[PDB]
């Protein structure tokens, strides 16, 4: 089902869903497991390379989540031309370092060559082991 998130870009993402959480409900990310999220977004600019960015917050300590795809053109058809929409199905390998944080916030961000192609911010979130 789709999850609850607010595109921090500019209405770019048309809707981001994950195969596990329900959205409004809380999400339990088990560090070490692959969390997949598909985000549709209308390329806000023409670029030959795009990158996805997922950052998880620890209700206090903000961290960055590596082990991801630093080039979403592998799932989307790059160059993403401004005015077309793309659907990226990416497997976000959760880091085994993620500490059981009572509340976590994941940020999905796409970046082409002119700025951030899109963006997403999840609220209700929780990490477990």
CSV table of N, CA and C in Angstrom, one decimal:
chain,number,residue,atom,x,y,z
A,1,UNK,N,0.9,-1.2,0.0
A,1,UNK,CA,0.0,0.0,0.0
A,1,UNK,C,0.9,1.2,0.0
A,2,UNK,N,0.3,2.4,-0.3
A,2,UNK,CA,1.1,3.6,-0.3
A,2,UNK,C,1.4,4.1,1.2
A,3,UNK,N,2.5,4.8,1.4
A,3,UNK,CA,2.8,5.3,2.8
A,3,UNK,C,2.5,6.8,2.9
A,4,UNK,N,2.4,7.3,4.1
A,4,UNK,CA,2.2,8.7,4.2
A,4,UNK,C,3.5,9.5,4.2
A,5,UNK,N,3.6,10.4,3.2
A,5,UNK,CA,4.9,11.2,3.1
A,5,UNK,C,4.6,12.5,2.5
A,6,UNK,N,5.5,13.5,2.7
A,6,UNK,CA,5.2,14.9,2.1
A,6,UNK,C,6.4,15.2,1.3
A,7,UNK,N,6.2,15.2,0.0
A,7,UNK,CA,7.3,15.6,-1.0
A,7,UNK,C,7.9,16.9,-0.5
A,8,UNK,N,9.1,16.9,-0.1
A,8,UNK,CA,9.8,18.2,0.3
A,8,UNK,C,10.4,18.9,-0.9
A,9,UNK,N,10.1,18.5,-2.1
A,9,UNK,CA,10.6,19.1,-3.3
A,9,UNK,C,9.6,20.2,-3.8
A,10,UNK,N,8.5,19.8,-4.3
A,10,UNK,CA,7.5,20.8,-4.8
A,10,UNK,C,6.4,20.0,-5.5
A,11,UNK,N,5.7,19.1,-4.8
A,11,UNK,CA,4.6,18.4,-5.4
A,11,UNK,C,5.2,17.5,-6.6
A,12,UNK,N,6.5,17.4,-6.6
A,12,UNK,CA,7.1,16.5,-7.6
A,12,UNK,C,6.6,15.1,-7.5
A,13,UNK,N,7.0,14.4,-6.5
A,13,UNK,CA,6.5,13.0,-6.3
A,13,UNK,C,5.0,12.9,-6.4
A,14,UNK,N,4.5,12.0,-7.2
A,14,UNK,CA,3.0,11.9,-7.3
A,14,UNK,C,2.5,10.9,-6.2
A,15,UNK,N,3.4,10.2,-5.6
A,15,UNK,CA,3.0,9.2,-4.6
A,15,UNK,C,4.0,8.2,-4.4
A,16,UNK,N,4.4,7.9,-3.2
A,16,UNK,CA,5.5,6.9,-2.9
A,16,UNK,C,4.9,5.8,-2.0
A,17,UNK,N,5.1,4.6,-2.5
A,17,UNK,CA,4.5,3.4,-1.7
A,17,UNK,C,5.6,2.5,-1.3
A,18,UNK,N,5.4,1.7,-0.3
A,18,UNK,CA,6.4,0.7,0.2
A,18,UNK,C,5.8,-0.7,0.3
A,19,UNK,N,6.5,-1.7,0.1
A,19,UNK,CA,5.9,-3.1,0.2
A,19,UNK,C,6.1,-3.6,1.6
A,20,UNK,N,5.3,-3.1,2.5
A,20,UNK,CA,5.5,-3.6,3.9
A,20,UNK,C,4.7,-2.7,4.9
A,21,UNK,N,5.1,-1.5,5.1
A,21,UNK,CA,4.3,-0.6,6.0
A,21,UNK,C,3.0,-0.2,5.4
A,22,UNK,N,2.1,0.4,6.1
A,22,UNK,CA,0.7,0.7,5.6
A,22,UNK,C,0.6,2.2,5.4
A,23,UNK,N,1.6,2.9,5.9
A,23,UNK,CA,1.5,4.4,5.7
A,23,UNK,C,1.1,5.1,7.0
A,24,UNK,N,-0.1,5.5,7.1
A,24,UNK,CA,-0.5,6.2,8.4
A,24,UNK,C,0.0,5.5,9.6
A,25,UNK,N,0.0,4.1,9.5
A,25,UNK,CA,0.5,3.4,10.7
A,25,UNK,C,2.0,3.6,10.8
A,26,UNK,N,2.5,3.0,11.9
A,26,UNK,CA,4.0,3.1,12.1
A,26,UNK,C,4.8,2.1,11.3
A,27,UNK,N,6.0,2.4,11.0
A,27,UNK,CA,6.8,1.5,10.1
A,27,UNK,C,8.0,1.0,11.0
A,28,UNK,N,8.2,-0.3,11.0
A,28,UNK,CA,9.3,-0.9,11.7
A,28,UNK,C,10.4,-1.3,10.8
A,29,UNK,N,11.4,-0.6,10.6
A,29,UNK,CA,12.5,-1.0,9.7
A,29,UNK,C,13.5,-1.8,10.4
A,30,UNK,N,13.7,-3.1,10.0
A,30,UNK,CA,14.7,-4.0,10.7
A,30,UNK,C,16.0,-3.8,10.0
A,31,UNK,N,16.9,-3.1,10.7
A,31,UNK,CA,18.3,-2.9,10.1
A,31,UNK,C,18.8,-4.2,9.5
A,32,UNK,N,19.4,-4.1,8.3
A,32,UNK,CA,20.0,-5.4,7.7
A,32,UNK,C,19.0,-5.9,6.7
A,33,UNK,N,17.8,-5.5,6.7
A,33,UNK,CA,16.8,-5.9,5.7
A,33,UNK,C,16.6,-4.9,4.6
A,34,UNK,N,16.3,-5.4,3.4
A,34,UNK,CA,16.1,-4.6,2.2
A,34,UNK,C,14.7,-3.9,2.2
A,35,UNK,N,14.6,-2.6,2.4
A,35,UNK,CA,13.3,-1.9,2.3
A,35,UNK,C,13.1,-1.3,0.9
A,36,UNK,N,12.0,-1.7,0.3
A,36,UNK,CA,11.8,-1.2,-1.1
A,36,UNK,C,10.8,-0.1,-1.1
A,37,UNK,N,11.0,1.0,-1.9
A,37,UNK,CA,10.1,2.1,-2.0
A,37,UNK,C,10.0,2.6,-3.5
A,38,UNK,N,8.8,2.7,-4.0
A,38,UNK,CA,8.7,3.1,-5.4
A,38,UNK,C,8.2,4.6,-5.4
A,39,UNK,N,8.9,5.5,-6.0
A,39,UNK,CA,8.4,6.9,-6.0
A,39,UNK,C,8.2,7.4,-7.4
A,40,UNK,N,7.0,7.9,-7.7
A,40,UNK,CA,6.8,8.5,-9.1
A,40,UNK,C,7.1,9.9,-9.0
A,41,UNK,N,7.7,10.5,-10.0
A,41,UNK,CA,8.0,12.0,-9.9
A,41,UNK,C,8.2,12.6,-11.2
A,42,UNK,N,7.6,13.8,-11.4
A,42,UNK,CA,7.8,14.4,-12.8
A,42,UNK,C,9.1,15.1,-12.8
A,43,UNK,N,10.0,14.7,-13.7
A,43,UNK,CA,11.3,15.3,-13.8
A,43,UNK,C,11.1,16.8,-13.8
A,44,UNK,N,11.6,17.5,-12.8
A,44,UNK,CA,11.4,19.0,-12.8
A,44,UNK,C,12.5,19.6,-13.7
A,45,UNK,N,13.3,18.8,-14.3
A,45,UNK,CA,14.4,19.4,-15.2
A,45,UNK,C,15.0,18.3,-16.1
A,46,UNK,N,15.7,18.7,-17.1
A,46,UNK,CA,16.4,17.7,-18.0
A,46,UNK,C,17.8,17.3,-17.5
A,47,UNK,N,18.0,16.1,-17.1
A,47,UNK,CA,19.4,15.7,-16.6
A,47,UNK,C,19.8,14.4,-17.2
A,48,UNK,N,21.1,14.1,-17.3
A,48,UNK,CA,21.6,12.8,-17.8
A,48,UNK,C,21.8,11.9,-16.7
A,49,UNK,N,21.9,12.4,-15.5
A,49,UNK,CA,22.1,11.5,-14.3
A,49,UNK,C,21.3,11.9,-13.2
A,50,UNK,N,20.7,11.0,-12.5
A,50,UNK,CA,19.9,11.3,-11.3
A,50,UNK,C,20.3,10.4,-10.1
A,51,UNK,N,20.1,10.9,-8.9
A,51,UNK,CA,20.6,10.1,-7.8
A,51,UNK,C,19.5,10.0,-6.7
A,52,UNK,N,19.3,8.9,-6.1
A,52,UNK,CA,18.3,8.8,-5.0
A,52,UNK,C,19.0,9.0,-3.7
A,53,UNK,N,18.3,9.6,-2.7
A,53,UNK,CA,19.0,9.9,-1.4
A,53,UNK,C,18.0,9.5,-0.3
A,54,UNK,N,18.4,8.5,0.5
A,54,UNK,CA,17.5,8.2,1.6
A,54,UNK,C,18.2,8.5,2.9
A,55,UNK,N,17.7,9.3,3.7
A,55,UNK,CA,18.4,9.7,5.0
A,55,UNK,C,17.4,9.4,6.2
A,56,UNK,N,17.9,8.7,7.2
A,56,UNK,CA,17.0,8.3,8.3
A,56,UNK,C,17.4,9.1,9.6
A,57,UNK,N,16.4,9.7,10.2
A,57,UNK,CA,16.7,10.5,11.4
A,57,UNK,C,16.5,9.6,12.7
A,58,UNK,N,17.1,9.9,13.8
A,58,UNK,CA,17.0,9.0,15.0
A,58,UNK,C,16.2,9.9,16.1
A,59,UNK,N,15.1,10.5,15.7
A,59,UNK,CA,14.4,11.3,16.7
A,59,UNK,C,15.4,12.1,17.5
A,60,UNK,N,16.5,12.4,16.9
A,60,UNK,CA,17.5,13.3,17.7
A,60,UNK,C,18.8,13.3,16.9
A,61,UNK,N,19.4,12.2,16.5
A,61,UNK,CA,20.6,12.2,15.7
A,61,UNK,C,20.3,11.8,14.3
A,62,UNK,N,20.5,12.8,13.4
A,62,UNK,CA,20.2,12.5,12.0
A,62,UNK,C,21.4,11.8,11.3
A,63,UNK,N,21.1,10.7,10.6
A,63,UNK,CA,22.1,9.9,10.0
A,63,UNK,C,21.9,9.8,8.5
A,64,UNK,N,22.8,9.4,7.7
A,64,UNK,CA,22.7,9.2,6.3
A,64,UNK,C,22.7,7.7,6.0
A,65,UNK,N,21.8,7.2,5.1
A,65,UNK,CA,21.8,5.8,4.8
A,65,UNK,C,22.4,5.5,3.4
A,66,UNK,N,23.6,4.9,3.5
A,66,UNK,CA,24.4,4.5,2.3
A,66,UNK,C,24.0,3.2,1.8
A,67,UNK,N,24.8,2.5,1.1
A,67,UNK,CA,24.4,1.1,0.6
A,67,UNK,C,23.2,1.3,-0.3
A,68,UNK,N,22.9,2.4,-0.8
A,68,UNK,CA,21.8,2.6,-1.7
A,68,UNK,C,22.2,2.8,-3.1
A,69,UNK,N,21.4,3.3,-4.0
A,69,UNK,CA,21.8,3.5,-5.4
A,69,UNK,C,22.1,4.9,-5.7
A,70,UNK,N,23.3,5.3,-5.9
A,70,UNK,CA,23.7,6.7,-6.1
A,70,UNK,C,23.5,7.0,-7.6
A,71,UNK,N,22.4,6.6,-8.2
A,71,UNK,CA,22.2,6.8,-9.6
A,71,UNK,C,20.9,6.2,-10.0
A,72,UNK,N,19.8,6.9,-9.7
A,72,UNK,CA,18.4,6.3,-10.0
A,72,UNK,C,18.2,6.1,-11.5
A,73,UNK,N,19.1,6.5,-12.4
A,73,UNK,CA,18.9,6.3,-13.8
A,73,UNK,C,18.9,4.8,-14.1
A,74,UNK,N,19.3,4.0,-13.2
A,74,UNK,CA,19.3,2.5,-13.4
A,74,UNK,C,17.9,2.0,-13.3
A,75,UNK,N,17.0,2.7,-12.7
A,75,UNK,CA,15.6,2.2,-12.6
A,75,UNK,C,14.7,3.1,-13.4
A,76,UNK,N,15.1,4.3,-13.6
A,76,UNK,CA,14.3,5.3,-14.3
A,76,UNK,C,15.0,5.5,-15.7
A,77,UNK,N,14.3,6.0,-16.7
A,77,UNK,CA,14.9,6.2,-18.0
A,77,UNK,C,15.6,7.5,-18.1
A,78,UNK,N,16.9,7.6,-17.8
A,78,UNK,CA,17.6,8.9,-18.0
A,78,UNK,C,18.1,9.0,-19.4
A,79,UNK,N,18.4,10.2,-19.9
A,79,UNK,CA,18.2,11.4,-19.1
A,79,UNK,C,16.7,11.7,-18.8
A,80,UNK,N,16.4,12.1,-17.6
A,80,UNK,CA,15.0,12.4,-17.3
A,80,UNK,C,14.7,13.8,-17.9
A,81,UNK,N,13.8,13.9,-18.8
A,81,UNK,CA,13.5,15.2,-19.4
A,81,UNK,C,12.5,15.9,-18.6
A,82,UNK,N,12.7,17.2,-18.4
A,82,UNK,CA,11.7,18.0,-17.7
A,82,UNK,C,10.3,18.0,-18.3
A,83,UNK,N,9.4,17.5,-17.6
A,83,UNK,CA,8.0,17.4,-18.1
A,83,UNK,C,7.6,16.0,-18.2
A,84,UNK,N,8.5,15.0,-18.1
A,84,UNK,CA,8.1,13.6,-18.2
A,84,UNK,C,8.1,13.0,-16.8
A,85,UNK,N,7.3,12.0,-16.5
A,85,UNK,CA,7.3,11.4,-15.2
A,85,UNK,C,8.0,10.1,-15.2
A,86,UNK,N,8.6,9.7,-14.1
A,86,UNK,CA,9.4,8.5,-14.1
A,86,UNK,C,9.0,7.7,-12.8
A,87,UNK,N,9.1,6.4,-12.9
A,87,UNK,CA,8.7,5.5,-11.8
A,87,UNK,C,10.0,4.7,-11.4
A,88,UNK,N,10.5,5.0,-10.2
A,88,UNK,CA,11.7,4.2,-9.8
A,88,UNK,C,11.4,3.2,-8.8
A,89,UNK,N,11.7,2.0,-9.1
A,89,UNK,CA,11.5,0.9,-8.1
A,89,UNK,C,12.9,0.6,-7.6
A,90,UNK,N,13.3,1.0,-6.4
A,90,UNK,CA,14.7,0.8,-5.9
A,90,UNK,C,14.7,0.0,-4.6
A,91,UNK,N,15.6,-0.9,-4.5
A,91,UNK,CA,15.7,-1.6,-3.2
A,91,UNK,C,16.6,-0.9,-2.3
A,92,UNK,N,16.1,-0.3,-1.3
A,92,UNK,CA,16.9,0.5,-0.3
A,92,UNK,C,17.5,-0.4,0.8
A,93,UNK,N,18.7,-0.9,0.6
A,93,UNK,CA,19.3,-1.8,1.6
A,93,UNK,C,19.4,-1.1,2.9
A,94,UNK,N,18.7,-1.5,3.9
A,94,UNK,CA,18.8,-0.8,5.2
A,94,UNK,C,20.1,-1.1,5.8
A,95,UNK,N,20.7,-0.1,6.4
A,95,UNK,CA,22.0,-0.3,7.1
A,95,UNK,C,21.9,-1.1,8.4
A,96,UNK,N,22.9,-2.0,8.6
A,96,UNK,CA,22.8,-2.8,9.9
A,96,UNK,C,23.2,-1.9,11.1
A,97,UNK,N,23.5,-0.7,10.9
A,97,UNK,CA,23.9,0.2,12.0
A,97,UNK,C,22.7,0.9,12.6
A,98,UNK,N,21.7,1.1,11.8
A,98,UNK,CA,20.4,1.7,12.3
A,98,UNK,C,20.1,1.2,13.7
A,99,UNK,N,20.2,2.1,14.7
A,99,UNK,CA,20.0,1.8,16.1
A,99,UNK,C,18.5,1.8,16.4
A,100,UNK,N,18.0,0.9,17.2
A,100,UNK,CA,16.5,0.9,17.5
A,100,UNK,C,16.1,2.3,17.9
A,101,UNK,N,15.7,3.1,17.0
A,101,UNK,CA,15.3,4.5,17.4
A,101,UNK,C,13.8,4.5,17.5
A,102,UNK,N,13.3,4.9,18.7
A,102,UNK,CA,11.9,5.0,18.9
A,102,UNK,C,11.2,5.6,17.7
A,103,UNK,N,11.7,6.7,17.2
A,103,UNK,CA,11.1,7.3,16.0
A,103,UNK,C,12.1,7.6,14.9
A,104,UNK,N,11.9,7.3,13.7
A,104,UNK,CA,12.9,7.5,12.6
A,104,UNK,C,12.2,8.2,11.5
A,105,UNK,N,12.9,9.1,10.7
A,105,UNK,CA,12.3,9.8,9.6
A,105,UNK,C,13.1,9.5,8.3
A,106,UNK,N,12.5,8.9,7.4
A,106,UNK,CA,13.3,8.6,6.1
A,106,UNK,C,13.1,9.7,5.1
A,107,UNK,N,14.1,10.1,4.4
A,107,UNK,CA,14.0,11.2,3.4
A,107,UNK,C,14.4,10.7,2.0
A,108,UNK,N,13.5,10.6,1.1
A,108,UNK,CA,13.9,10.2,-0.3
A,108,UNK,C,14.1,11.4,-1.1
A,109,UNK,N,15.3,11.5,-1.8
A,109,UNK,CA,15.5,12.7,-2.6
A,109,UNK,C,16.2,12.3,-3.9
A,110,UNK,N,15.6,12.8,-5.0
A,110,UNK,CA,16.2,12.6,-6.3
A,110,UNK,C,17.0,13.8,-6.7
A,111,UNK,N,18.2,13.6,-7.3
A,111,UNK,CA,19.0,14.8,-7.7
A,111,UNK,C,19.5,14.6,-9.1
A,112,UNK,N,19.1,15.4,-10.0
A,112,UNK,CA,19.6,15.3,-11.4
A,112,UNK,C,20.9,16.1,-11.6
A,113,UNK,N,20.9,17.0,-12.6
A,113,UNK,CA,22.1,17.8,-12.8
A,113,UNK,C,21.8,19.3,-12.6
A,114,UNK,N,20.5,19.6,-12.3
A,114,UNK,CA,20.1,21.0,-12.1
A,114,UNK,C,19.7,21.2,-10.7
A,115,UNK,N,19.6,20.2,-9.9
A,115,UNK,CA,19.1,20.3,-8.5
A,115,UNK,C,18.5,19.0,-8.0
A,116,UNK,N,17.5,19.1,-7.1
A,116,UNK,CA,16.9,17.9,-6.6
A,116,UNK,C,15.7,17.6,-7.5
A,117,UNK,N,15.8,16.5,-8.2
A,117,UNK,CA,14.7,16.1,-9.1
A,117,UNK,C,13.4,16.0,-8.3
A,118,UNK,N,13.4,15.4,-7.1
A,118,UNK,CA,12.2,15.3,-6.3
A,118,UNK,C,12.6,15.2,-4.8
A,119,UNK,N,11.7,14.8,-3.9
A,119,UNK,CA,12.0,14.7,-2.5
A,119,UNK,C,10.8,14.1,-1.7
A,120,UNK,N,11.1,13.5,-0.6
A,120,UNK,CA,10.0,12.9,0.2
A,120,UNK,C,10.4,12.8,1.7
A,121,UNK,N,9.5,13.1,2.5
A,121,UNK,CA,9.8,13.0,4.0
A,121,UNK,C,8.7,12.2,4.7
A,122,UNK,N,9.1,11.2,5.4
A,122,UNK,CA,8.1,10.3,6.1
A,122,UNK,C,8.1,10.8,7.6
A,123,UNK,N,6.9,10.8,8.2
A,123,UNK,CA,6.8,11.2,9.6
A,123,UNK,C,6.7,9.9,10.5
A,124,UNK,N,5.6,9.4,10.7
A,124,UNK,CA,5.5,8.2,11.6
A,124,UNK,C,6.5,7.1,11.1
A,125,UNK,N,7.5,6.8,12.0
A,125,UNK,CA,8.5,5.8,11.6
A,125,UNK,C,9.2,5.3,12.9
A,126,UNK,N,9.6,4.1,12.9
A,126,UNK,CA,10.3,3.5,14.1
A,126,UNK,C,11.2,2.4,13.6
A,127,UNK,N,12.4,2.4,14.1
A,127,UNK,CA,13.4,1.3,13.7
A,127,UNK,C,13.5,0.2,14.8
A,128,UNK,N,13.7,-1.0,14.4
A,128,UNK,CA,13.8,-2.1,15.3
A,128,UNK,C,15.0,-3.0,14.9
A,129,UNK,N,15.3,-4.0,15.7
A,129,UNK,CA,16.4,-4.9,15.3
A,129,UNK,C,15.9,-6.2,14.8
